[PDB]
Every structure is written in C-alpha cells, then in structure tokens.
Amino acid sequence: INNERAYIPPGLMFNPLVPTRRAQYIRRNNNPQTAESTSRIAPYAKPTSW
Amino acid sequence: GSGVGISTGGWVGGSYFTDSYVITKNTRQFLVKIQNNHQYKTELISPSTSQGKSQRCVSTPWSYFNFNQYSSHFSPQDWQRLTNEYKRFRPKGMHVKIYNLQIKQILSNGADTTYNNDLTAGVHIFCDGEHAYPNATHPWDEDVMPELPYQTWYLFQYGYIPVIHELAEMEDSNAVEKAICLQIPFFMLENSDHEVLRTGESTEFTFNFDCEWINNERAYIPPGLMFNPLVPTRRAQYIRRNNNPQTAESTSRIAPYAKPTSWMTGPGLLSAQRVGPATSDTGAWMVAVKPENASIDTGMSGIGSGFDPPQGSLAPTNLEYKIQWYQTPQGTNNNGNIISNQPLSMLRDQALFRGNQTTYNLCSDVWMFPNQIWDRYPITRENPIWCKKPRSDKHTTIDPFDGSLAMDHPPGTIFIKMAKIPVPSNNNADSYLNIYCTGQVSCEIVWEVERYATKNWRPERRHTTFGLGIGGADNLNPTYHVDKNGTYIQPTTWDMCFPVKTNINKVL
Amino acid sequence: MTGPGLLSAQRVGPATSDTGAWMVAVKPENASIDTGMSGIGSGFDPPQG
C-alpha cells in the first residue's frame, strides 16, 4: 500500500516548451459557425495516452 | 594522448543487420545555447486568447537529448530492411557518447559576431538512471535526432508542469486551491551530482531495456473468421418473435459457414467529437481531475489533457480520429501533414454492431471485455520508439494508442547545460559570459530482432520504392533525397513511410 | 462486482444469414460493402457471458 502523491495527472507529463508533431482535424461544426479546419497541436496541452 | 588538440572519439554509423539482432549506429553535431539565462522562472505559458489553458510550467537552464523516434536510428533503407525481413523487434540496449566538445565564446562588437573559441570552460552533463525529475520526453514532440545525419542538432530547453494552472489559479477564498498551490514541487537538476566536462573530456552512458516486442505481422482474417466452413456445426439459433414486420420466432441450426465466435473486438471510444477552437486543447476526451470544491474558470477546456487517438483499434469514422502529423516544423495547416491510414491488416479494424433485432447499428464505446483481441498500432518510421509508463498503484493492460511502447524506466534523459561563467560588476551581477557548446553524440542501440518463416505459398507483400513518389523544387528527385537547393524531400502521406504490420502474414 | 456480459442486442434477421446479435466485422475505411453488416465478420455467441 503506497503512501505517495502525484503532483500532476499522468496525462500532464510533457515539456510544454517543445513543439509537438501532431495535428487536429475538427469536423464542420454544423451550427453555430466555424467550418472545419486542421491545425497543429499547441506546444502546451499536448495529447496523452493514459 | 589526452588534452586539447586530441579528438576523443570518431564518427560512427552505418547499421549492421544480423539475423538475431540489428545494431544501428548514429552520430550528430549538436549545440547548447544557454537557454533562459541560467535562472529558472516559471513562465505561465498561455496564448492570449486568454481563454486558453495557460499552463504555468517551469523553465530551466538545462537542455536535453531526445533519442525517441525510429526515423532517427534507421535510414529509409535500414527501416524497410527490417520491416520486410523480420517478424518483430525491440531495442535491446543503448549506448550514448558525448565527445569532441567545443566552447566557442560568443562575442558581439555590435551587429556581426565573433567566436574566439575558448578553453578552460565547462559543460554540465546529467543523466537519469532513477527517473527522478519530471522527464521532459513526450512521445511525439518535435526534434529528437534529425532523421538525416550531417544535420546539426539543436537541443531544446528542459521544462515541466509543476501543477495544473487552474486549481491554484486561484480564485479568492479558498484553501482547497491554496493547498495544491502550496504543494507544487520544485525540481532542480543541480541537486544530484553530475559531470562537468572541458573540451578534452568525454562521457559515456549505457541503457538496458525491459521492453515489449513490436510485431511486424499481418492477420489475413479476423480472429472470429477461423474455422472450417465445410464442416457443419452443432449449435442453434433461437430468434425472438420479430413484433413487426413479420416472421414469428423459430429455432434453427447454425449454417456451416458463418459459425459463431468468441474473441470480441478491441476497445475504442468513437462517440465524442473534438470541442471548440484550436489552441484550446480539443481532445474530444478530457481526463481532467475535478477535485470536490476547488474552483474552475470556463472549462473543462482548460483542465486535464485530451485523450488521443480514440479509437484505439476499432476503425475510425472520420479523419478526426485518424491521428496526423506534419513531419516538419515548417508545416502549415495543410502542408506536410501526412495522415495515418489503415494497414489493411484484419485485426485492427474491428467494428461492433449489436442492435436492433432488425438492423445492425455501429456502437460507440466498446470498453474492455474478456475475450477481446486488438492489434497494437502498426506504427511507422516516424513514430516515437517508447513512452514512459507513469508510476501508479493500479493500471490496465497498458497498450498506448500512439503505438510506441511503455516502460517502467525508459532511457534516462540526458541533460546538458553550459556551466554559467559569471563576470564581475558593481551592483553586483546578474551577469554572465555568453558561450555555447558543440559536440558529437553517438547513439548506438542494439535491437533484439526475429526473422520470419511461413508456409504461405504466395508472394506476400513488401515495401517498394514504388509506393514512394517524386517531389521537391522542380519535381526532380523522388522522396528520400536532397533538393537542389538541397532540402531533404519529405515523404507525403502514409505509405511513403513504410509501416510495420502491413507485411508478412501470421496464422492466428 | 459481477462478471461482464452483453445483454442489449437481439439476433438480426433470417437464419443462414449469420444472426449473432453482435457482429465483430472489420469495416476498413473505404473498401466497399453490399447489404450488410450481415455479411461481414462473425457473430459473437453467447453474450452473456
């Protein structure tokens, strides 16, 4: 039985300074607005497993 | 000999390829830039668009070596020599050598620049054997080694997220976000000891891997399709009264073909859709936290991380789940931008239907279930080799949907810094001497490899250059090759990069 | 907790058509498909377990 604490979620482990090679396709929104577009994932908030 | 004027080690490379193992050797030229002065700060990154997540992070003077990717260690021929000729492979070990260091002492007279070289200067080099410290390496990221040697390798600053920025933002009150703000850990690479190196000195590092095989193999049929359709079956189908249109209930023997099966499809999550504008972290699945009180701004958003790709397995509906990457920092929205594709392996596709008493209707979710089989992501030459499995009490099967791998202890990240050299002043300080380092890393890794034999009569499939296509400048030069103009032409879409798991075959 | 099962589905259509109430199938991204579902993949039997 482990007495220990994770100071961050497991999906929050990454260097936010470094850019990522990945992309986000976003479907046509079909109301309100903002038709579909693809874009690179921001350096912060990289996707995760886990 | 020893000292300045005597090179420490020579260049290395060229791979190997023996039936039992493959030794890939690589060497680079790198430079350390003195990031972030030598002080740390925090930096509270954000764009603005202040609605963004605005993770606070931490910046450090340190830079690190990221060796994690296949295209770094394998030439387009070395890859495709194993992808064609072997069932499976896993990295057995790793050996890294820093050597031939140089400290060049940037000078500025205004405009211009001058480099006086230097001696009597130093470079800090630190490795993680314990994987204490937040370990910057994330599977995709950028950089790693340039897939192409002779290409100088610029290191990137080391940073980490101490705590979620929201939840400790903090809003008035609170004492729930006061804690978690008080508890944010602060890590420093000074702490545990590490080596400093002048020019004449070098350093070696070794690594060993407790590691799962990555399999290059193909299932020619679904696992539920394995049976002799000629032989009749002993089994029966009761079918409930249809209650419109017609055809009252009846029992019947299952046809010799199309026998029932065990072996459920692999799990996936198909229902969600990515949410909102880009730069806001649209994952379609946010893990987050949600402590019981805390406080939260707009979001969701904005807390936690997007889960990508769901999937896994369970062939996706549209492009939104299909992964993607730009294989280039210059890549704009649509440019670079090679998109993952189906291997045509049968494992590995896995719809699920259920419904309706009348029609079958593809079902969202499909969580874990006892008999499930899925095939790990087929990867490709562009993928990260490994990913660190975070230490926790309990976990499930641990199959990352990025492909890659999970290890308790991956290769320890090698950190390197420029050894602040201060200069006197009246105030006094903060002032330091402007220098940079340059040298050669040789990453030599051994791959446990297994060679395939099969009873199939037919030719199976390999990776030709004919999947490749012509590009760059005036169209001349094909794909992996220089421009005129010379710029390495990047492979466009998925088949160019030659994925494992699309070749050979396996009887299930 | 109790053991897992799948109870929602119902076997679909006439006999000899492989009515499993759960079809695993494949669905590659393009391909082409006739009537079905049906007709691709295998019925999962018994759900339960």
Add this chain to the structure above:
Amino acid sequence: SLAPTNLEYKIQWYQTPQGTNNNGNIISNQPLSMLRDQALFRGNQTTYNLCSDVWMFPNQIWDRYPITRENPIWCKKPRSDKHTTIDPFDGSLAMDHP
C-alpha cells in the same frame, strides 16, 4: 477513483457504535493527490459533458483508495475461476489467504 458528485458516493463511517445518524460520522475527503480525481468528459462537439460509467480501458491509471488509520487492513479475495485487476474500493487489500 473518478471523483464523486455528491456525498452519496463519498463513503462515511461513524468510528463509534454509539454514533447516531449525524454524530461520529466522519466522511471521506479528497486527498488532493492528482491521480485519484479523474473526471471524464467526451461530448459534445460543442461542450464537454461529464460521463457516467467509464468501465475498464487499456491505458487506464487510477490510484488505490488513500485509506487512513481507521480502515481495514485486508479483505479476502473470494476463490473463483476468473477475475479482473482486483483493486478493492474500500482501500484495504485482497489476499488469497488472509
């Protein structure tokens, strides 16, 4: 895991036989550990909507219940043919033979 909505999921105990409905009655709380909270959202193409369930899934990580001094040390894992990961949500422990 999967931080609860209201008190109804939050466990509770009276740490006393004399404990009436509200008396004794110490209630479990969040450790503030980050593992260990774990919402999940999905939805909507527009908004995220906290989702019920979340069954087992390949990449999952959770943190075993933080327990406390008042908890049972162990629990007997009943003999059966098949079972899953076996993490009791009371904290405690599972053993073939306690």
Add this chain to the structure above:
Amino acid sequence: ERRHTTFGLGIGGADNLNPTYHVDKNGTYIQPTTWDMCFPVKTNINKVL
C-alpha cells in the same frame, strides 16, 4: 512537501478541554472528527510519475 501535524487535529470532549486523541474527564477517548484528523496515507511525500 507535506506532513501530518497535530494542527490538523482539533479540541473536543466534555468541557472542550483535551484535544483529540486523548482521554476525557469522565475519561472517554475523544474521537477524531472528520477526515483529516485520521491521517491518511497518499496525501504526503510526492512521486514523479
């Protein structure tokens, strides 16, 4: 990092005197009231994941 102080504890029993884990006057062991009193593991130290 973080530890378990008695300051998480609080005074109770009879006339309020005696803090928490302690006898009453009257002596009856004062019981810890709510969760932090009982000192849970996993709220302390830290681990790099």
Add this chain to the structure above:
Amino acid sequence: GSGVGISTGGWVGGSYFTDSYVITKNTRQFLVKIQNNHQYKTELISPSTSQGKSQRCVSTPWSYFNFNQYSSHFSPQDWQRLTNEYKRFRPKGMHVKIYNLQIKQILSNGADTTYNNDLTAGVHIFCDGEHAYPNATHPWDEDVMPELPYQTWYLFQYGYIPVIHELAEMEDSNAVEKAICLQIPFFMLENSDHEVLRTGESTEFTFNFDCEWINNERAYIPPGLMFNPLVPTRRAQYIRRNNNPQTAESTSRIAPYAKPTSWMTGPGLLSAQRVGPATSDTGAWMVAVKPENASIDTGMSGIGSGFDPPQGSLAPTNLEYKIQWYQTPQGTNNNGNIISNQPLSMLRDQALFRGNQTTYNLCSDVWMFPNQIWDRYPITRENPIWCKKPRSDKHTTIDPFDGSLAMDHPPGTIFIKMAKIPVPSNNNADSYLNIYCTGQVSCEIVWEVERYATKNWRPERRHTTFGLGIGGADNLNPTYHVDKNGTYIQPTTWDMCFPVKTNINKVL
C-alpha cells in the same frame, strides 16, 4: 589526463539521510574580484553622522569562503526531513574542494568589456588550521553560500578590526592611548605559506568538529511542573504577617497540586532598552572596555559592542528583544524582515516573579544561579551553524544566544586572492593586470544525527507546507520556488523557515 582542457572535478550535491548520519553535498560557482587593488590600507570605515563609532578596521586584497549557515547546506526539504525525523544533529566533518578554476582577464576598450580568458595565471588559496589571523567569519553577516545552487557566489573582502578606533583616536596628551595605538597588530596573509593554482590545478580541504549537539526536541511542561499532583506532599508554608490588608500569619501544608520545585529559570537581561539612533550601534547592553584613563568622545556609543539578544531564554517583553533578520540584502526597514517567534516549547519561556508579599512582579536580570535550566535558542534554517569561541583564560557555560554553536577551532576560513600580475611602467608602478577567477567549491559535510523514539500516544507535530504561504509577482508560486521573473520567493515570518525544537517531545 591533466592540464588545461581537462576538468578537475564534477558537480556534486543531493544529500543522503541515513539513520546514523546525514551527508549534505553542495557545489557553487564563485568569482574573485581583486578587491582593494592588492594593497591593504585601513579605511577608517564610519558613516558621517561623524558621531558614529567610526571603526578603523583593515582592508585586505583577500576574499574568503563563508560556509556558516544551515540554509546553505540544506534544501527546504532536506531541512524538515531532519527537523521532523531526528532528535539531534551536529556536523561531524567537512570537506571542501576548489576546482575548475578560470582566469578571464578583464579588458576595457572603453564602455563595453571583453574577456580573453587567460592561461599562465594564478590564484592564491589559503586556509587556517591554527586560526591564527583575525578570522572574518561572524555568525550572521550576509552571503555565506547562496541557499539556492546555480546561483553564482560572489566572495567578500577580508578585513578585521586591529583596535578600537576611539582609545588611540587619540586626543592630545596621552601615552595611555599612545600605547594601544602602538600595539595594534598588523596581520598579513602572505606570511604563512599557501598554494597558488593555475587553471588545471585544484585543492582540497578537510575539517573535523569537536562540537556540541543541537537538539530538536520539545518540553511539554516546565521542569518545575514535574510531579504527581495526586500524591500529597510533606512540606509546609509559613507566611509572614501581611501588614495590610489583613490575614495574619499562618502555617499550612502545601497542596498536593502545585508542589514547590528546584530548577530555576534560565538567565536573561530584560531591563535595558536600545539607546539612540540607528547606525550608532544600539545594543541596549554595551560591553565596552573603559581603561582607567584613556580618553573618550561622546559615548559609551562608540566603544565596545552591543550585546544581542538579551534575553537569552526568559521570554522577552517586546519586539526589541525578539531578534529579527531581513533574509535578503535588498531588505528595507520593513520588507523581508522575518521576526523570531516563540517555539511554544515550555523550557524556553521562563519568566520570574519574586515580589511583593502581595503581588508577583516580573523581575529584570536573573543572572546565573545553581539550579537553572534553559533551552538553547531553537534556531531555524536561516541561522549560522557555528561561532568561534574566543581564546581566553576563563569563561562561563558558553551558550550563544544566537543559537549557532561555539567551537575552539571552527572550520578554518578559506582565503583566496587573485595573484597580482604587475605591468611595466616608467614611474614605475603602481599598476597591475585586471583579472578575475571563477570556479566551483564543493562543500560536503557529514552530520552526526540521532533518530527519535518516544512512548507518546498522540500524533505530536511536524512541519507541513501548510505553514508556508503564497507569494511573489502575481501571487502565484507558494514560498520556496521561483518567480516568473524568476526570483526565489523568500519565506515570510518565522514559521516558514522550519525551526527545530518545535517538534517531537521529550520527557524531562
């Protein structure tokens, strides 16, 4: 290897923590500035406000390493790991290494600057094993090592007071101040031999401590409160005739509770008040000298030293006795400015009353008395580790009220200088080449440490981060942590710094 281009030693740190002992390791980057040309002078410091003390002192070309403080050798976690987990500790030994030296040869073309590095240059390094020489180190001072590594460490000039400036000022006459002026000693670090180092060379120093334990422990009751109050006592109280208001004399048995005690309170001096304006040395107790004739200006003042804090022990009346410090050179009158506080330990408070036949009246003084018990100052992470006990024929118990410690031979101060490199001229001289040194000190000290066991049923007390609080820039980041902006946030008031002696317990 050896010579330029081969680093002499690597970085070190990270502490240790075994039950029997704790090994703290630290490393720094320092620079020596060539203070005071290479000549000595005297400098007759003073402000003006000519009424001030105007100590004459002496300046030297030398700089010195001050290792004396706890916050230098212990991270905020290492401290609080021993403060929570151990009864007592004392430094067992000390090992210091100068290495990775650099001589950078300042140049000025006007405005700007340039640093050509240098070779064939040297650095003088001298240590005191005998503690001859005036030994600059004073417990509080400034500087020491920066509590935070990676922070370059600027050395400070070595100087000393040869003789009290007044008494030898001297006024007309005198022959009483003519002597004591003639007898002022003049110390020089050239004298006894010492090592010079070019770049490739390094130096080590070791130290051993004959040293008293510093105890982290708490008395839950006064020493006079130890008795079984249930059991009756055999003793009696005669009480004199009251002579107003009433109640003529009577004898009676002492109540079972509140039995008399031995064990007087520790000594203190509470009567005095600090005298006059700041910068005039207001101590509230001046030791001075007063030779029989001499001559003296205004003052008191102005001769001798203020005694601080009185106290000791004997809980103070107002802030004036409560010590204080700014934990920062930028600290203004009220800023920084963390003030000492009561440990809530019961030893350690110690009023005394006497009086009146009617009322008790808190009494000034309380000198030494046979049965006295007091508790040494609880210290904290910010305190000096040791103080040198001056050599003299006779002395009393020797408990410094700054906490710290007294030793016959403390760690010998390590002195370092830039090795004057002259340049030819016609006059000729005085002229020299402008250089500075840079390098790395590693102070690795071993701590005899003892771990606590007790029969108490109850949880006792520890040091949480919850005593800590949020600060810096926009309020984000808690306490020991970087700003954004990164500047290490300083702990504000007393509990932040985690004092020993406020935890555990001890049966007296």
Add this chain to the structure above:
Amino acid sequence: FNQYSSHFSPQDWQRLTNEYKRFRPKGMHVKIYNLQIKQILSNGADTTY
C-alpha cells in the same frame, strides 16, 4: 484483527505515514494466554464469580 487503528498508535501511524513510501504487513504472530474461567453465579439480582 483487521484494521490499522488497532495496530498503530496515532503517533506510530503518522510516523510511517510521514516517513515512508510504502508498507505491507510481512507476518503476524498471535498468542492467547493468561486464561481465566470465572463461573458466573446468580443468587437472584447481584452476581458472584
């Protein structure tokens, strides 16, 4: 015997909760001894042993 508060004083607990990553019970040893059989008697009301 199953509970932590039975085997750990409020200080023993919090000595491990503060000072250790992890713990599991390694072994257990139980001893019944100093037995007494007191033979309840009732003459009505009262009691005698």
Add this chain to the structure above:
Amino acid sequence: HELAEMEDSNAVEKAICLQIPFFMLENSDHEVLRTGESTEFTFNFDCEW
C-alpha cells in the same frame, strides 16, 4: 492548565493544547505475574557523594 484553558480566540493556546502528550503504560511491554511468580529489578547509580 492555564495556557490552553483556553480563552476564546486563540490559536496560541490552541497550540500547546493540541500538543499535550498522552502517555500510557501499556505501550512498552511489561510483566504480568500470578501468585507463584516473582520479579527482580536492579539499578546502578552515577551519583554524587
């Protein structure tokens, strides 16, 4: 008793009230004796004349 009495407020007497130690002679082991058994104890003195 005073100083932890405690008067309204306080948090200065709240501490020193929270920190009151509670000692129990059960704790450390000791001998039980029926009739037939006995016990010896010895002591040595570092002591002034």
